[PDB]
């Protein structure tokens with residue numbers, strides 16, 4: 001497949017924000033010709049199932065089919081659309097009423113804003129009328145791993161893509177002990193997925209991290225501690241307050257030394273320690289990056305320059321209500337991709353509809369969030385006992401709401417085992433009231449007493 005020399009809409013990166021923008025552009029302009037350039041070999045696909053539902057499939061071919069059952073048992077593909085949705089890049093200029101093409105296996109390596117042109121890694125050049133940068137993020141590594149040898153590096157997984165799901169799933173069936181470094185939602189999701197697999201055979205899964213509990217940077221202490229206990233009960237050796245000093249090999253085994261003196265022996269490492277946005281194109285492009293939040297600096301309309309927009313993980317945007325931010329979540333990529341697509345077809349609209357976040361630690365435990373969520377912000381938590389419907393599966397102390405406050409106004413919300421109430425949370429954040437009583441506000445989420 002060969003890119004044309006010119007395309008009206010060029011989308012750089014072939015993930016969630018690009019796919020959503022393509023969909024939005026085609027809705028706004030049913031004859032649009034849209035080219036997605038994607039460095040990966042696969043068509044656009046969603047990432048969340050890679051750490052969740054693909055692990056809970058009992059079909060041993062799931063690795064090949066990439067089809068998963070949602071918690072409620074409905075089956076679907078990780079791909080946003082099948083191959084029949086797309087047209088070829090070479091045919092894109094000619095097909096009547098246009099289409100969406102994906103040039104896979106190609107990376108955009110230079111952006112020339114003045115001449116509305118990009119160059120690919122193979123030396124082809126493509127001129128565009130409107131461009132979206134949707135390049136996503138790259139995993140941080142741990143310095144202790146960077147200092148270790150090549151064997152350690154080759155037995156350390158940075159969990160991002162289909163290839164990683166496949167490689168780690170295989171490892172899971174081969175080794176006796178896997179260690180996850182990182183206490184965030186992704187680390188914790190992998191801990192639960194791996195712990196579930198380990199269970200039949202009682203093999204070992206370790207999760208270690210510097211905080212006092214799982215998701216300690218986002219959740220307050222009570223709930224972070226509650227979450228750690230839940231992960232432990234999934235059959236995981238959880239080691240909080242753990243700072244890695246070094247990692248080496250010995251007797252074929254990986255040896256992890258912690259600052260506090262503890263040592264861990266394991267067969268494979270998964271490092272889930274957060275991300276950096278992929279801003280390589282900003283230097284050739286002369287595009288500003290945000291030194292406070294990372295990412296391309298764009299405005300409330302996701303716009304960087306006259307015919308360049310940025311969406312998804314890579315976009316540091318101005319939120320008129322909540323302030324400048326960069327958000328790295330699936331629904332944000334959907335919302336911002338869609339918005340950029342509308343703005344690329346004349347919309348001129350600001351980011352307004354607040355995107356949400358979720359995480360499931362199996363069919364039985366679910367979190368959703370929206371707005372400014374950071375455990376350093378003042379929080380107020382209101383909780384209750386869970387009913388049988390308060391879990392991710394049935395949706396399609398055991399529950400509660402956490403309010404995140406700034407200038408005594410709710411700027412963020414976390415819902416713990418409370419589903420189908422995101423719109424209420426969104427409306428509370430939108431209205432920016434000073435609430436006399438957050439226990440009264442908790443009643444909007446069916447949390448009483």
Ligand SMILES: Cc1cc2nc3c(=O)[nH]c(=O)nc-3n(C[C@H](O)[C@H](O)[C@H](O)COP(=O)(O)OP(=O)(O)OC[C@H]3O[C@@H](n4cnc5c(N)ncnc54)[C@H](O)[C@@H]3O)c2cc1C
Pocket residue numbers: 012013014015016017018037038039040046047048049050051106107108109134135136137159160161186278311312313314328329330331333356357358359360
């Ligand atoms: C395992 C996993 C589980 C997750 N679970 C959740 C969840 O439960 N809930 C949630 O809210 N969020 C979740 N996320 C986060 C969510 O997937 C991301 O926020 C989302 O993928 C961001 O979309 P994006 O378009 O910005 O980037 P991506 O979807 O990452 O797409 C960027 C694509 O562009 C490619 N690319 C980069 N640079 C170039 C270039 N120069 N040329 C060509 N191609 C390029 C990249 O290789 C990549 O394929 C998860 C992420 C992972 C990895």
